[PDB]
Amino acid sequence: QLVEQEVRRLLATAAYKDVVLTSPKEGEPWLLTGYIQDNHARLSLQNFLESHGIPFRLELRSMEELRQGAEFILQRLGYHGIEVSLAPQAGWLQLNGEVSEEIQKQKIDSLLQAEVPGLLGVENKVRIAPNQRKRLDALLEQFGLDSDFTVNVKGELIELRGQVNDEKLSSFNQLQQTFRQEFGNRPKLELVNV
C-alpha cells in the first residue's frame, strides 16, 4: 500500500541501492538489511521510517566502516603498503599497493573476511614487491661469486662476507653498481673482509 510505496520509492534512489526491505506481516517490524555508503545515510533512512510511524529493525552495514575496519586490520597485522578502497559489488573492498611474495601466500583477502564483519569479498590488486634477496643471489650466481661471498642480512643492511682480494673487490663493485641501478638505496650492500 501507500506507505510501503513511499518507502520503496526512497529505496529506488542511489543512496539506498544496496538496501533490501522485507515487508512485515501484521504487527511485526519492517526489516531492512544490506549496505549503505556511510552511517549518515542510515540515520536519514531511520528518520524517514520514523516519520511514517513505521516500526522497524535495521540490519545495515556502512561501506566506509567496512573500509576503515579493513585498514585497521591491515595495520595491526603489519601490512603497510596497502590501500583499501571500495569495489564495485556491495559488501566488497579492493586492495592496491604491494606486498612480498612470502606475505602474498597468507591469502589476505580471505583473512580480511575473517577479521571484518560483513565483508563479502576482496578484489586484491596488489602487486608483488621487489625481492632484493632473490635478485642479489641471482647476480652472485650469474657472476660466479656465490662461493666467494656469504650473504648476511640484518634488516635492510646486507653484508657480503669473503676473503677480499683485488678480483673480488672489483667484482663486488660491479655487482653493487648493478644492484643500485635497480633498487636505488634500499637495501644497502656492504663488503666485509673476513
Residue numbers in the entry: 154 to 347
The authors write:
acts as a connector between the secretin and the IM (YscD, PrgH, MxiG).
* indicates the junction between YscC and YscD. to Y. enterocolitica injectisomes by YscC and YscD. about the interaction between the YscD and YscJ protomers. YscD units would lead to a poorer match with the experimental data. the YscJ 24-mer further supports the proposed stoichiometry. forcing a preferential perpendicular orientation to the IM. confirming the preferential orientation found in the 24-mer YscD ring assembly. YscDJ ring modeling has been performed to test for any elasticity of the basal body.
